[PDB]
Task: inverse folding
């Protein structure tokens, strides 16, 4: 359980009261201004190696739903792009809106997408996620925008279990899932140094935000929107608009992998 949320009283505007790093120098998300984000030809190609992925559980954590992976060995890993070394996939989760016109955390020329998928990875130079979160290169989060259109067949297994995890703390087995089914065809990206977008807002993340959104259906996104922030029998707070808005870029540069 957790004290914070996305309401007027417990939401992003107030997180700095408990997490003063909320007003820090490398906070996420950010707007990606395509007039000022510059192509960097020294960026390597991004390497997604998810064939050996081992999914474990799906959980309503009170702010989102998350799907966890066995990160005890190099199985599903992210390498290349801006990264040095190997980063193991730990979990994925989403942020979404009440309406299709909002829901993403990152924006592109101020445009908000209907949702955003985060695949969270940690740097194996550290022992575990707990050590990695204390370092500036501890995590790599691969961010993928969702737009509404045709169904994403690789999302359907997720959508099909959401009715079983409606309220905070509900969970299920979630085995044999292939996260490659959530990727777009193109791996062109923007990258910058930032932070977790949820508490504790640690400044430990290399963000890799893909340019090409995936398409999901209205049925699929509606299932997201029928989840609850609350626990069982508590006053219903539909789980929508669980996104932090864009934060000041301060001294940073966003780099593009493409011209
Ligand atoms: Zn807790
Ligand atoms: Zn996230």
Result:
């Amino acid at each position: 359980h957790h004290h914070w949320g996305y309401g007027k009283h417990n939401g992003p505007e107030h997180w700095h009261k408990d997490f003063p790093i909320a007003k820090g120098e490398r906070q996420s998300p950010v707007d990606i201004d395509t007039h000022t984000a510059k192509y960097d030809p020294s960026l390597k190609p991004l390497s997604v190696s998810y064939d050996q992925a081992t999914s474990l559980r799906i959980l309503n954590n009170g702010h989102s739903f998350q799907v966890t992976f066995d990160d005890s060995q190099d199985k599903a890993v992210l390498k290349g792009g801006p990264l040095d070394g190997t980063y193991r996939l730990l979990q994925f989760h989403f942020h979404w809106g009440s309406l299709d016109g909002q829901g993403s955390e990152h924006t592109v020329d101020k445009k908000k997408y209907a949702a955003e998928l985060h695949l969270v990875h940690w740097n194996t130079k550290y022992g575990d996620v707990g050590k990695a979160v204390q370092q500036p290169d501890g995590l790599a989060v691969l961010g993928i925008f969702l737009k509404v259109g045709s169904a994403k067949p690789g999302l359907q297994k997720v959508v099909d279990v959401l009715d079983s995890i409606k309220t905070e703390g509900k969970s299920a087995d979630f085995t044999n899932f292939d996260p490659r089914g959530l990727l777009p065809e193109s791996l062109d990206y923007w990258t910058y140094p930032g932070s977790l977008t949820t508490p504790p807002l640690a400044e430990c993340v290399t963000w890799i935000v893909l340019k090409e959104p995936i398409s999901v259906s209205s049925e699929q996104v509606l299932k997201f929107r029928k989840l609850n922030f609350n626990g069982e029998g508590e006053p219903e707070e539909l789980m929508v608009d669980n996104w932090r808005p864009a934060q000041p870029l301060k001294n940073r540069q966003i780099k593009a992998s493409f011209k």
